[PDB]
Amino acid sequence: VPRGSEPPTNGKVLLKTTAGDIDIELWSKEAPKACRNFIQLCLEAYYDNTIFHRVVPGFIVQGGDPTGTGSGGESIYGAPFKDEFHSRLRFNRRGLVAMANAGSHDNGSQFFFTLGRADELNNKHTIFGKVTGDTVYNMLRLSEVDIDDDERPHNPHKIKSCEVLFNPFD
């Protein structure tokens, strides 16, 4: 049993992006609100044709804003929803999927992938999924971009489509 061993995932989403396919396994037991939100938005096409508008080298690449501006996007709930943390879901490696926010209990639609560690985000951002080992390279390629001074890529990568491969709420 490795240190930092994570609970089993349940739920799978496939993003078809301009950097390749990215396969996300979901922690639906530990972060049910975030997982339900992500699945439903995925199903409703809400993430289709959306950009990855923010890249911080070695830290995060962030997307999920239907406006592409960095400030838009809303949850399925009619208001931003609560954080969901778990002591076994930690920012101790690259390839995790977490919700963006601008404070406590402020989850909307924007989410990000971790490009490195981000321990300082532990207990601040909901971690709701992880990228499969065999799609991490494509996830990292989202960050392989020339960037402006507001962390915006000159030519952002995009999600063409999102599909739910296994829906744990069915």
Numbering used by the authors: 3 to 172
Wording from the paper:
Cyclophilins are peptidyl-prolyl isomerases (PPIases: EC 5.2.1.8) and are characterized by their ability to catalyze the interconversion of cis and trans isomers of proline. In order to understand the molecular basis of these results, we sought structural coverage of the entire human cyclophilin enzymatic class. We determined crystal structures of seven human PPIase domains—PPIC, PPIE, PPIG, PPWD1, PPIL2, NKTR, and SDCCAG-10. All cyclophilins share a common fold architecture consisting of eight antiparallel β sheets and two α-helices that pack against the sheets. The active site of the cyclophilin family includes the invariant catalytic arginine (Arg55) and a highly conserved mixture of hydrophobic, aromatic, and polar residues including Phe60, Met61, Gln63, Ala101, Phe113, Trp121, Leu122, and His126.
No binding was detected for PPIL2, PPIL6, or SDCCAG-10, making these, to our knowledge, the first set of human cyclophilins that have been found incompetent to ligate cyclosporin. We were also able to confirm that under the experimental conditions we tested there was no evidence of CsA binding to PPIL2, PPIL6, or SDCCAG-10. Three cyclophilins neither bound cyclosporin nor tetrapeptide: PPIL2, PPIL6, and SDCCAG-10. It is clear that these three proteins are quite divergent in the active site compared to PPIA. Perhaps more importantly they are, along with PPIL4, the only isoforms that substitute the residue Trp121 with a non-histidine residue. The molecular function of the PPIase domain for these isoforms is unknown, but our structures suggest that these isoforms could still serve as proline-binding domains. Indeed, our assays show binding to the standard substrate suc-AGPF-pNA even where we do not detect isomerase activity. There are three distinct classes of conformations adopted by this loop: the PPIA α1-β3 loop family, which includes PPIA, PPIB, PPIC, PPIE, and PPIF; a shorter version of the loop represented by the structures of PPIL1, PPIL2, PPIL3, PPIL4, SDCCAG-10, and PPWD1; and a longer version found in PPID, PPIG, PPIH, PPIL6, and NKTR. For PPIL2 and SDCCAG-10, both of which have been found associated with spliceosomal complexes, it may be that it is the non-active surface of the PPIase domain that performs the major function as in the cases of PPIH and PPIL1.
